Design a binder for this molecule. Structure first.
Ligand code: HEM
Ligand code: HEM
Ligand code: HEM
Ligand code: HEM
Lengths: 141, 146, 141, 146
């Protein structure tokens, strides 16, 4: 459960991400594919080489969805409804992988927000990514 | 892996009583029912829409038998699961694109099936031995991923 | 999310457990300590030998809590409120261990309910234990 | 574990720039803040009630330094982490009763700290190398549990 303070922390941090959201999304993906190669089993149809348009494009989609979630943090289940349907009935990514991407997103943020990524913000962001992950896996069964 | 001789003989003894075809079909079917996202690899298989459809699906049964047969053969080489499963590991990564987390899920469902099948004979020590084996097999199958 | 069918399945199965609930609770614990020895790190103050009164006693408490959860399956957060406080602020068991106990409970049920433990009931029970686990870890942060 | 020489030199190079005392205090403090149930082992340590209290707590800093120092020494024996950490593994199991899942949590927090510290120098390939190392260390520390 996100406390008001958590929501303030997430809005502040993501605010500073602003326009780089797509670039950070792609970086997080690349970090995930290199650190946790098992995640590549879900992207056999992509060119996963560095700088690939497919990864950049996907990174931007992931980032926009997170932007949408931050904007509607009080109403995430509704805001992400179409995305939970998509992952539950179509993509069917095993839930363990959400953790892996969440960690890589956190690392990406840490590497780009030296001043913003305080212990308290780190905690709030981890909580937020866990909530997004919970919503996206809500309808799996 | 590393089993004590009493664990090894526990695994061996119980397995001599297993109908591999039947247990295979059951374990794969229950995997597809309890964790429906695993159905992702099998849409070539027909009707998987209800529990009864999954459990009665002949392709599910056939594949279950193929999987448990390979598993069976690995019980004969508990000292070197990685060598035994290296080719299959490669295949599941490069060609089939199966997230190795699926191997862990199947291992746990298999333990539930053995428990259901054997009842009180599937004692806590026997379960412990089988948990080591299924973790070992999952490991071995994930070893050549990249 | 437990569907009405899931709730019917859980009530039916747990109904058949009835009076053995405590005995099954202890068995599940013993299965957990043997199969996943890392879980013993939370019980250094117990005699964990087979048949120990401490384990039997604890098994009964676990089982009664699950009985309480089945009775209030539409209102679990409230029903288990004291228990979530206890695990979050006192016991502080790492969330991964809930999975391990859930699996051993499932195995115990399978071994004792040959006729009841159908594929559909198995699915409902796993879902139910995951929901209980989610509630008990709700207040960790 | 198994690092390619380019992974090994990546790990080594970055680590030569780490202030072990400072990074240690930070990683342990953030572990206690982001995953507060880990505070369970440290109530002898004083005030852990707010993020600022945790990060400024001298016992947390001292312990963080002790932990990362042992970690440091393990980087010198990447070829045999299990042998290097066998005694500590035993200690954490038999005497300290630390669930080895804590080692994994700390490994991930340490990676976040390195990223925060080094910024763009902590590239995806370097992170990948460090992930293998922290998983290896967690493994090594969990190896003698029973
Ligand atoms: C923070 C959690 C995540 C978010 C917000 C997210 C969001 C999205 C979005 C917005 C799409 C595009 C949907 C569309 O085309 O309309 C998508 C597609 C997809 N996602 Fe997720 N995702 C997440 C986690 C994951 C993880 C962990 C995996 C696998 C490791 C994954 C695998 C995929 C795949 C395979 C696609 C399809 C890509 C394609 O064919 O172009 N997702 N995701
Ligand atoms: C006990 C663990 C497992 C073993 C021993 C195993 C073994 C095998 C074997 C022997 C084959 C046939 C290979 C060939 O044709 O040359 C196979 C194929 C396959 N397996 Fe695995 N498997 C295991 C687990 C899984 C899991 C959990 C899944 C996914 C849920 C999976 C998905 C597949 C698929 C999709 C194929 C291809 C079937 C086909 O072509 O129609 N396997 N496996
Ligand atoms: C289905 C999930 C579980 C349920 C329903 C449950 C329920 C309970 C209950 C009812 C108590 C007794 C509280 C009291 O004294 O008032 C308790 C205590 C405790 N639980 Fe949990 N628990 C669960 C999972 C776990 C897990 C996974 C662990 C660790 C592996 C764990 C470790 C403990 C410990 C250490 C105590 C204290 C025992 C003592 O000192 O006597 N619990 N639990
Ligand atoms: C990188 C992983 C870790 C390493 C290398 C490590 C290493 C050490 C070392 C060198 C000591 C001192 C042993 C002695 O006095 O003889 C120690 C003690 C201890 N560690 Fe670990 N540790 C690690 C992770 C953890 C984690 C994650 C926790 C729990 C959150 C933990 C909890 C403890 C505790 C409670 C002590 C006792 C401190 C005392 O007596 O006051 N350690 N560890």
């Amino acid at each position: 459960m996100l406390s008001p303070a958590d929501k303030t922390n997430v809005k502040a941090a993501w605010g500073k991400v602003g326009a780089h959201a797509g670039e950070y999304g792609a970086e997080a993906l690349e970090r995930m594919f290199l650190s946790f190669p098992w995640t590549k089993t879900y992207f056999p149809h992509f060119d996963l080489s560095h700088g690939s348009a497919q990864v950049k494009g996907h990174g931007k989609k992931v980032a926009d969805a997170l932007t949408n979630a931050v904007a509607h943090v009080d109403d995430m289940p509704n805001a992400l409804s179409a995305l939970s349907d998509l992952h539950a009935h179509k993509l069917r990514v095993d839930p363990v992988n959400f953790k892996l991407l969440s960690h890589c997103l956190l690392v990406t943020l840490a590497a780009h927000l030296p001043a913003e990524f305080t212990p308290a913000v780190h905690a709030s962001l981890d909580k937020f990514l866990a909530s997004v992950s919970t919503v996206l896996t809500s309808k799996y069964r | 892996m590393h089993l004590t001789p009493e664990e090894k003989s526990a695994v061996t003894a119980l397995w001599g009583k297993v109908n591999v075809d039947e247990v295979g079909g059951e374990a794969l079917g229950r995997l597809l029912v309890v964790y429906p996202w695993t159905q992702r690899f099998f849409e070539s298989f027909g009707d998987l829409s209800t529990p009864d459809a999954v459990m009665g699906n002949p392709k599910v049964k056939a594949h279950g038998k193929k999987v448990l047969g390979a598993f069976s053969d690995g019980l004969a080489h508990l000292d070197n699961l990685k060598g035994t499963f290296a080719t299959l590991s490669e295949l599941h990564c490069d060609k089939l694109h199966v997230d190795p987390e699926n191997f862990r899920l199947l291992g746990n469902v298999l333990v539930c099936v053995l428990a259901h099948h054997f009842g009180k004979e599937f004692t806590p020590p026997v379960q412990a031995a089988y948990q080591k084996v299924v973790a070992g097999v999952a490991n071995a199958l994930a070893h050549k991923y990249h």
